[PDB]
Structure formats: structure tokens, C-alpha cells
Request: fold
Amino acid sequence: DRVLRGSRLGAVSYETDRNHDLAPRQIARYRTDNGEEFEVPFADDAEIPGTWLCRNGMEGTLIEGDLPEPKKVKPPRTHWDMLLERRSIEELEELLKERLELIRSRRRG
Amino acid sequence: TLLQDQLQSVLDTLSEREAGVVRLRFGLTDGQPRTLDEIGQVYGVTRERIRQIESKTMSKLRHPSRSQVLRDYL
DNA sequence: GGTCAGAAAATCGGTTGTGGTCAGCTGCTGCCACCGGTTAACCTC
Reply:
């Protein structure tokens, strides 16, 4: 009545699992913020980046102090800055001093 | 699997220099083929001598006297 | 009535050489995916 066909997106090879003449491997070590080593077996002919994602949840950096670069991180959209893009310093400071005078006359009496 | 074993036997029916030449030519020992002058460097003769040996060995393998067991593996 | 000596094969191996061909590499060539500004369409201050 209803017989179909189908396959998952992937092909299957047929090799032999030899365990001696493998590719030469360098073992690299990374580290997260919370002291979590994650041993990464690379190739021996392989560039080692300073940072690498781990199962710990974050991009764990290298265990070396060779590449400590923290530079390119900033919040591009702060409410203060997008306030500054539409409101001027004297207008904002006038509003601030008016509300300060109001709360001085309210709390003081 | 039987093809791999029959290939190993027929490859070992010939001598070791041309055997390792074919193995390095096709990556049957490591999965990575080599250049002709690379095989000539790791053996000890020039790459053109290597090419002559390779061509005549390929003809010897192509001969029916050794192609009997691989005639209909396709 | 032997006797080194030369000519000429073939055979493994360099060589040179050279020619081409292709893997790939990579700066233009140009098209293609978000991003949002604007421009004629709906509800009544």
C-alpha cells in the first residue's frame, strides 16, 4: 500500500580501523575562566589559536600567557549614548537640575 | 575486504622495490600518495628511472597472468 | 694458431630539458543578501 524510501543527509564509507599509522598529533591545552582544562588533540602540523570553544560553556583561552589580548569588546548601544545622540548636554543638565530642585523642595520642604 | 586481501597478495607477488613504489604512488600504506621525485628521493634513484620502473610495473600488473584474480572485481 | 684489442650491442641509470599543463591563488567583476528610508494607501483627531 504505502512503502517509501529515504536516507539521512550523509554517506557511509567502508574502511579498516587500523590504529598504528595515524596522522601525527599535537595535543593542545586550553583553559576556561573557572580553571577548566580542555585537552585538544590537534595535528602535529596544525596552527594553535589562542582561544577555543569548550563544553564548559565559554570560549576557553590558551593555557599560555602568550596571547592575552582582551581588546575588542565593547557595548555598542548603551542607553546613555543613545540618549546623547538625541539630547544635548545643557538640556539634559537643565532637566537634571530641575528635578534636583524639585526633590530638594519636596524632601527638604 | 576480499578485494583488499587479494590486492595485498598480488602486490606481494612482485618484488619489494616496485611494490613499495606502487604503495607510495597510491597511498596503500598510509592513505597519502607521493610525488614521483619524492619516491625517487626516498628510494635513491632519479624520478625518471622511477617513472620507467613504475610504467613497466603497471604493465606487469596489467598483464592477464596477474589480472586473473581481478578480472571481474568490477 | 694463440691473443690482446676494438666495435658494437644492451641495460640500468642519470640528465637535461624542456615543454606543457594544471593546482591553485588571488585581485578585480559583478551579482546577491539585510537594512532601513520613503511613498502612496486606511482610520477619523
